[PDB]
Amino acid sequence: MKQLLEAGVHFGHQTRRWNPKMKRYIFTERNGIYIIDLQKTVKKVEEAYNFTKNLAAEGGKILFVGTKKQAQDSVKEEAQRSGMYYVNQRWLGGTLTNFETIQKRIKRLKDIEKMQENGTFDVLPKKEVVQLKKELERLEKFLGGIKDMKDLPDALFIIDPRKERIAVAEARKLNIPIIGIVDTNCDPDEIDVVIPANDDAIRAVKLLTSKMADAILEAKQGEE
RNA sequence: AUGGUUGUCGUCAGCUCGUGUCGUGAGAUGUUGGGUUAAGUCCCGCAACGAGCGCAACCCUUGAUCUUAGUUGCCAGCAUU
Numbered sequence: 001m002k003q004l005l006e007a008g009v010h011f012g013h014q015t016r017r018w019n020p021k022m023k024r025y026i027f028t029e030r031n032g033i034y035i036i037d038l039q040k041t042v043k044k045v046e047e048a049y050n051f052t053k054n055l056a057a058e059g060g061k062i063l064f065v066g067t068k069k070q071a072q073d074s075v076k077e078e079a080q081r082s083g084m085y086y087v088n089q090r091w092l093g094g095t096l097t098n099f100e101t102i103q104k105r106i107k108r109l110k111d112i113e114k115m116q117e118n119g120t121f122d123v124l125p126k127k128e129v130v131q132l133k134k135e136l137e138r139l140e141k142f143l144g145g146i147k148d149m150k151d152l153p154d155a156l157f158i159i160d161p162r163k164e165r166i167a168v169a170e171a172r173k174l175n176i177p178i179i180g181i182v183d184t185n186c187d188p189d190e191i192d193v194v195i196p197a198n199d200d201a202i203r204a205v206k207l208l209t210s211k212m213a214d215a216i217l218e219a220k221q222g223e224e
Numbered sequence: 225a226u227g228g229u230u231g232u233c234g235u236c237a238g239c240u241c242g243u244g245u246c247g248u249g250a251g252a253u254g255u256u257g258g259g260u261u262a263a264g265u266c267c268c269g270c271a272a273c274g275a276g277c278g279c280a281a282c283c284c285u286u287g288a289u290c291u292u293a294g295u296u297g298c299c300a301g302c303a304u305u
Contacts, residue, residue, distance in 0.1 A: 093254095093272030094244050101243055101273045108274095138267090166271060169245085 002045035002211065004038075010204030011036045011197055013184040021188035022161075025196045034184055041197045045211060048179060048193050052157075052212060053219030055177070060154025062216050064209065065180070067091060067163035070202050074209035075159060076145075082213035083220060084157070085148015091163075092143055096153050097170045105143050112136035155179070157212050159199065161186035181208045 015033030018026070027035040056062060064079030064086025066072060072088030079086040087095065095102060111118075112135060121129035156171045158164045161182030168190050171178035179193025188194060198204055 090269080091271095093270075097271095098244055098273060104243095104274065143273095166245090169271095173245085 001049060002042050003207075004042060006207065007038065007041060007045075007197075010201055010207050011038060011041065013198030013200055015184065018185045019187060022182060022184060022186045022194075022196070024188065025194075026184065036184055036197050041195070044194055044196060048195060048212065049215050051193065052179070052215045055155070056216040057219050057223075058154075061085065061149045061151070062212075063096075063149065063153040063156040063158075064088070064213065065156055065158035065160070065164055065167050066209075067160035067167075068199070071159055071199070071205055073202075074205040078206075078209035078213035079148075080145075082217045084213070084216065085145050086157075087143070087145045089142055089145075091167060092146075093166070095146070095167065095170055096156070096176065097173050099152060102143070102146060105139070106146060109136070109139055109144060109147065112139060152176075158191075159205070159208065161191070161199075 012033055013036065015029065018034055023034065025037040025040045027037045029035070052062075062079070062082075062084040064075040064082065064084045066075035066086065066088040067090075075086045075088040092102065112132070115132070116136070120132060152174075153176065156167065156176060156178040158167050158171070158178055158180035161168070161180065162185075164180075168178060172190070177192055179195070180191050181195030181197055181199060182188070182191055183199055184196075195208060197208075199208070
């Protein structure tokens, strides 16, 4: 149930270069972009609300996938205060597709985290805690958010239809569900729940990650 | 026919694999791009993530001292040739 007047601050994206696939829902082109179709964004937002809620209540983690600059606040704050464990940094190569070696990276994050209070310092010299503290300092800042997915990512809320293209291929690898807000200059048939709206406005990112993350959040704690 | 052993290419810095992806395939990707180093050394981007031998360091010697300890070694500080 998208805020229809509140949706009037997140309709707009690239234009003059829009493919034929993700342009069927286009309203019209008035001199700067194609105006995205509003009512399609509303009804699709309802499909993400009901399907994201009811499918999110089956118990599986939601992958708050985000790439772009200023797309990490909506996914880190949205999922990090939501219930999913996503990755808003530069994308790891083959995130779900590796599924074990990313786990062993979770092992280096595990001994790096638990080695902080594990007497990791004060055993070896200053090069040990210095180089190793650089190791978790340059490991946790890249691949820490996967700790909220010990099983496979049951769904991929990807927030970047172009920058996250290797992610869309990764979820294309398994039969996993990958719904996401893909821009006007994107490919339509690659995703299963199209959020046909822009992503340029950061307030559009807060409305997208807030509707998604709040959808899975409010739909999930209602068991008691 | 060989085991064992040893030269050089050369202390030059390379040489590979597990997993994943691409490509019908052989293959590739990592190992390429950006700098920086003696170094595939280090860092950062990167469809890759990791590890193995290599590099390095660890070993010995070399110039600085401390502490232990002074005999055949050293002789300041005294007599002695």
